[PDB]
Design a protein around this ligand. Structure first.
Ligand code: B12
Ligand code: B12
Ligand code: B12
Ligand code: 5AD
Ligand code: 5AD
Ligand code: 5AD
Ligand code: K
Ligand code: K
Lengths: 152, 152, 152
């Protein structure tokens, strides 16, 4: 069980660090959501502390992510298909963050199952992966980059 | 077995997203193989669908990768030694993609062993890791960056 | 046991490749520690060879990392708190490298436990994660970027 905790906190750290690099690309251009990614890094620090102690993890950050998801989704065109992860430098970095966030979620789920950590931790990471997907699309749109949809 | 499928599709996604970021660095310079990386992202979407359904996975993309590997290898100097992963921004990003692709292959192999997915999926990822290695060397060469070989 | 070796050598490779990309960002600016990261890539090649053969792994590189850690730590302000992984492009890329290095260490530890590889390999990766943390802080400081500390 302690192996699983080290894996979970390590991959949360890998996620926060990948977001840190994406944040650098954002502040360099004229994007205003850098502060949202920085706030997420603070919550990921609290996630790491919660995994390592089970402990309480409030649902406040989950509802905040849901609010941001709604805000960006309502500015995007309809989408009912997978997109190629691309869309510009910021968008592609956010899709990498998104995939790492899904990997962190996979490491947290067993801990939730064994009752070792709050289920809200896994739900936060689940919403974060949707936030990162939506934010990538938003950045690509704001940069005038076309959303690429493969079907065959 | 369902844990293994989520791990395999997640790491395929992580691979396609890392390639998306490398693709951004490519289109920014005067490199012409951006369309090859984009085609690979489409096949990786088909890989994800095949892992998630076992299902048929044609060998067409494998032979196409083998053709591209031959095309680039025949323009490179001889190499019988490990290189330091570097060679410029594009080349170093492709070596990271290459390592992630090997990790995706490690997640797919157990599914092939249990008969749960087509062996052609693992062979595609195996050839992709050779393609990404060769493409990194090619990008480094086209940029005039020296191939670094450590021996001691 | 052979699955574990492939996982360990693959994640060492992923680490060296991530360092290669960080190295590209370093040489682009006026930072002088590019040669230290390149030397680390050479040792990581030797780590891969040691994991794959158990085999001897000298402690020379460990003491060299400890010397470099001391050199940079003695130029930094005191820190008794977690920082948000950021600090500029180079610093944030090094924090990602740091997290990947911790993941490589997690893959090496079981091999050390089963007596299959030298414990010095795990200690090298442990010191490398401290080196990458310290180097990130140093790069951020040299760039005039403020160290971000979240508490709440
Ligand atoms: C396996 C799977 C994945 C895998 C592999 C996907 C792939 N490359 O094939 C991975 C982990 C990579 C993945 C990622 C995502 N997924 Co997914 N995935 C699935 C799944 C389970 C099967 C997909 C499949 O194999 N389809 C077979 C192929 C041949 O179908 P297709 O012709 O491409 O048609 C698909 C699309 O039209 C898709 N679709 C329909 N509406 C929408 C809307 C959006 C925004 C997207 C992206 C897709 C989508 O549904 C069809 C049927 O699968 C479906 C649920 C299901 N059982 O169908 C969810 C599903 C398509 N995924 C979903 C989501 C949310 C996503 C992500 C945005 C998650 C995230 N935050 O990272 C990403 C998007 C990735 C991208 N580049 O666009 C949703 C989409 C609807 C929605 N918005 O609620 C679904 C329907 C699951 C659900 N929530 O109910 N997914
Ligand atoms: C463990 C291993 C790895 C590990 C660790 C490697 C390391 N850092 O030590 C990892 C997973 C990182 C790795 C990666 C790769 N590997 Co490898 N690896 C091996 C292996 C199994 C042992 C290597 C070893 O420990 N040698 C001990 C050290 C001390 O030997 P050395 O003095 O450095 O001499 C080696 C090189 O000269 C090498 N070599 C000979 N010809 C060539 C050609 C090329 C292009 C390269 C890169 C190396 C190479 O062979 C010698 C003996 O190992 C060998 C097969 C074997 N049993 O020897 C394959 C081998 C060297 N790998 C091979 C390949 C293809 C690669 C990759 C290109 C795979 C990919 N697409 O990612 C990368 C290259 C990475 C890089 N930066 O250059 C091939 C090279 C020949 C070829 N082209 O067919 C081999 C021979 C396997 C095979 N296919 O038969 N590998
Ligand atoms: C779980 C854990 C992690 C997890 C999650 C951390 C998190 N986000 O909560 C992960 C794997 C991400 C992590 C990473 C690191 N960790 Co850690 N970690 C721990 C641990 C075991 C518990 C942390 C915790 O949950 N605290 C609960 C929260 C609420 O406490 P807090 O109010 O934030 O107060 C903490 C800080 O003040 C911290 N602290 C005190 N002095 C210093 C100095 C430094 C440089 C740092 C970064 C922190 C630090 O100690 C307090 C108590 O934990 C502690 C040891 C312990 N049992 O306390 C080590 C510890 C804090 N980690 C330590 C280190 C070295 C690090 C890394 C630099 C390792 C590396 N090279 O990557 C990184 C720093 C990451 C960053 N962004 O700053 C050291 C710090 C002291 C030192 N320099 O020796 C400790 C004390 C372990 C030890 N070596 O004895 N860590
Ligand atoms: C969109 C699809 O992605 C798969 N899915 C959901 N969460 C994860 C995760 N953390 N890692 C990988 N795959 C995941 C499910 O199959 C879902 O339906
Ligand atoms: C080049 C060497 O890399 C190792 N190898 C082959 N495929 C993978 C993979 N997916 N992940 C990690 N290591 C791998 C084998 O030992 C091979 O000989
Ligand atoms: C700083 C904290 O990080 C955790 N820790 C130590 N090494 C690793 C690793 N390789 N991967 C993940 N977490 C690790 C321990 O709990 C330590 O106290
Ligand atoms: K992993
Ligand atoms: K960049």
């Amino acid at each position: 069980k302690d192996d699983q905790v080290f894996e979970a906190v390590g991959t949360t750290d890998e996620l926060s660090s990948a977001i840190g690099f994406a944040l650098e690309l954002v502040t360099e251009k004229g994007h205003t959501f850098a502060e949202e990614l920085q706030k997420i890094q603070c919550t990921l620090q609290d996630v790491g502390s919660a995994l390592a102690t089970y402990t309480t993890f409030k649902a406040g950050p989950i509802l905040e992510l849901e609010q941001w998801i709604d805000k960006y989704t309502s500015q995007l065109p309809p989408l009912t298909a997978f997109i190629l992860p691309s869309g510009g430098k910021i968008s592609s970095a956010l899709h990498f963050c998104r995939a790492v966030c899904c990997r962190a979620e996979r490491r947290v789920v067993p801990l939730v199952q064994m009752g070792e950590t709050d289920a809200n931790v896994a739900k936060f990471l689940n919403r974060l992966s949707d936030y990162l997907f939506t934010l990538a699309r938003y950045a690509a749109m704001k940069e005038g980059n076309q959303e690429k949809i493969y079907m065959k």
